[PDB]
Ligand SMILES: NC(=O)c1ccc[n+]([C@@H]2O[C@H](COP(=O)([O-])OP(=O)(O)OC[C@H]3O[C@@H](n4cnc5c(N)ncnc54)[C@H](OP(=O)(O)O)[C@@H]3O)[C@@H](O)[C@H]2O)c1
Ligand SMILES: Nc1ccc(C(F)(F)F)cc1N
């Protein structure tokens with residue numbers, strides 16, 4: 176099972192400046208619950224966005240996708256194609272925009288957090304992938320975060 180997990184503003188922005196322009200503590204617990212114990216695949220930029228102290232994420236098989244021949248990610252496996260990173264019973268692609276887009280054709284599930292924040296799309300932003308008609312998703316109820324923002328969860332799936 177290959178899944179994609181991300182948090183977006185309603186506008187689809189997921190990253191900017193090598194960072195995420197909000198904080199949603201509930202989503203961090205939700206992200207950790209979904210990915211805990213499994214393989215996580217991420218782009219090399221996303222891997223660089225994590226501080227060295229949190230790298231690699233605990234309890235998960237961290238894999239970093241890069242075109243650099245002998246790129247070294249201390250604590251993670253480095254592969255040159257996504258397919259090499261996808262060989263586990265359960266794999267979660269955790270970003271970024273480039274790797275979500277590359278990974279979607281191999282994905283059966285998407286766990287999407289939508290953050291009710293008026294964040295306009297900006298040139299150079301990392302964006303969430305657009306899900307077509309083949310994706311059947313369940314919309315969650317609006318939830319209020321300890322951070323003061325409103326959000327809701329989407330669980331998409333295709334057969
Ligand atoms: N849930 C979220 O909101 C969320 C989750 C994660 C990340 N983000 C944000 O996403 C942003 C970064 O996403 P990004 O799209 O800018 O960069 P990225 O997708 O995280 O990783 C980009 C890198 O992936 C590697 N790559 C891309 N296609 C490849 C391929 N076909 N084969 C091998 N390697 C490949 C390249 O690494 P080389 O340059 O080494 O070739 C490329 O530089 C950051 O702002 C981060 O905070 C948000
Ligand atoms: N600290 C931290 C920052 C960003 C991520 C993300 F999944 F978005 F890549 C995970 C963690 N654990």
Ligand SMILES: [Co+2]
Nearest residue numbers: 208209211212
């Ligand atoms: Co699990």
Ligand SMILES: [Co+2]
Nearest residue numbers: 283332333334
């Ligand atoms: Co299924």
